[PDB]
């Protein structure tokens, strides 16, 4: 049949602030609204994917991202999304997009630039790779 694919990207910042896996209240509100919409949608699958930046081992990133994806998926289930169609996977840094652009951007500032602030800048620059994507496939 006809499909429509949606990807809702929620940054780890918005979702967990500085914490490992505690959902911020505002995040829960947004996810509840999403779950409500999905319950009124001709959905096929709701795949929650956790992503991290390269600042971690394969093992560490996969575990953290899976936990974060699970927490988001569990919230959606708590708000009505059928367990039968939902999944939570940890993709770690496998699809990271900010490593090169950021390493280049930062090195472009070495004038005694704290040397430590360069790393801070790196972590801030690669923020887009720290997030959870909710991928929904529905029938048109």
Q: Could you write a compact summary of the structure shown?
A:
This protein is α+β, with helices and mostly antiparallel strands and 140 residues long. It is 41% helix and 23% strand. Strands 1-4-2-3 form a four-stranded mixed beta sheet.
Number of helices: 5
Could you give the order of the helices and strands?
Answer: EHHEHEHHE
Q: Please identify the oligomeric state.
A: monomer
Q: What is the number of independent domains?
A: 1
**Strand arrangement, largest sheet?**
1-4-2-3
CATH architecture: 2-Layer Sandwich
Tell me the β content.
15-25%
Largest sheet: 4 strands, mixed
CATH topology: 60s Ribosomal Protein L30, Chain: A
Estimate the helix proportion, in percent: 40-55%
Shape type: elongated
Beta strands, count: 4
Structural class: alpha+beta
**CA-based gyration radius:** 17 Å
CATH class: Alpha Beta
- The CATH superfamily bears the name OmpA-like domain
Distance between the termini: 8 Å
Written account of the structure:
This protein is of the alpha+beta class. It has one domain (1-140): 60s Ribosomal Protein L30, Chain: A (2-Layer Sandwich), CATH 3.30.1330. The protein contains 5 helices and 4 strands. Strands 1-4-2-3 form a 4-stranded mixed beta sheet. The longest helix has 21 residues, at 58-78. The termini are close together.
Blueprint of the fold:
Elements lengths: L2 E9 H5 L8 H14 L4 E9 L6 H21 L7 E5 L8 H9 L9 H9 L5 E9 L1
Parallel strand pairs: 2-3
Antiparallel strand pairs: 1-4, 2-4
Helix pairs in contact: 2-3, 4-5
Summarize this structure as a short list of keywords or feature phrases.
140 residues; 60s Ribosomal Protein L30, Chain: A; 4-stranded mixed β-sheet; 41% helix; 23% strand; elongated; ion transport
């Amino acid at each position: 049949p006809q499909y429509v694919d949606e990807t809702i990207s929620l940054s780890a910042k918005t979702l967990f602030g500085f914490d490992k896996d505690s959902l911020r209240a505002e995040a829960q509100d947004n996810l509840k609204v999403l779950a409500q919409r999905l319950s009124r949608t001709n959905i096929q699958s709701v795949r929650v994917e956790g992503h991290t930046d390269f600042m971690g081992s394969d093992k560490y990133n996969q575990a953290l991202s899976e936990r974060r994806a699970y927490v988001v998926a569990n919230n959606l289930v708590s708000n009505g999304v059928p367990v039968s169609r939902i999944s939570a996977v940890g993709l770690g840094e496998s699809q990271a997009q900010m490593t090169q652009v950021c390493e280049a951007e930062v090195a472009k500032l070495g004038a005694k630039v704290s040397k430590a602030k360069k790393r801070e800048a790196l972590i801030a620059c690669i923020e887009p790779d720290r997030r959870v994507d909710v991928k929904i496939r529905s029938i048109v």
